[PDB]
Design a binder for this molecule. Structure first.
Ligand SMILES: [Cl-]
Ligand SMILES: [Cl-]
Ligand SMILES: [Cl-]
Ligand SMILES: [Cl-]
Ligand SMILES: [Cl-]
Ligand SMILES: [Cl-]
Ligand code: NA
Ligand code: NA
Ligand code: NA
Ligand code: NA
Ligand code: NA
Ligand code: NA
Ligand code: NA
Length: 91
């Protein structure tokens, strides 16, 4: 049923490798964001990934925050990695 591990199995490094690969892939097609940053390949700097103190084995999403910077812009992103399913959502 699961195309993916439980979030408590995923290290911060694995979480960041996935969100980075995913975001850079989708950045190609996101016009508003590319025009904003002025590049399809921004530089990325990570923030602290906060995990729940309680119900650790039950967490379904890891929040992976990062700034993406290009020549014309810098913007904060909140990647919601849904670990068990194989995807990220962005707010
Ligand atoms: Cl960093
Ligand atoms: Cl992060
Ligand atoms: Cl977090
Ligand atoms: Cl779970
Ligand atoms: Cl749940
Ligand atoms: Cl922030
Ligand atoms: Na299952
Ligand atoms: Na996955
Ligand atoms: Na999970
Ligand atoms: Na890392
Ligand atoms: Na968009
Ligand atoms: Na989280
Ligand atoms: Na789903």
């Amino acid at each position: 049923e699961d195309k993916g591990p439980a979030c408590y199995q995923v290290s911060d490094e694995q979480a960041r490798t996935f969100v980075k690969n995913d975001y850079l892939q989708r950045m190609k097609r996101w016009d508003n964001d590319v025009q904003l940053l002025g590049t399809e390949i921004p530089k990325i700097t990570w923030e602290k990934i906060e995990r729940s103190l309680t119900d650790v084995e039950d967490e379904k999403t890891l929040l992976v925050p990062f700034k993406a910077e290009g020549p014309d812009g810098k913007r904060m992103y909140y990647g919601m990695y849904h670990c068990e399913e194989g995807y990220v959502e962005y707010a």
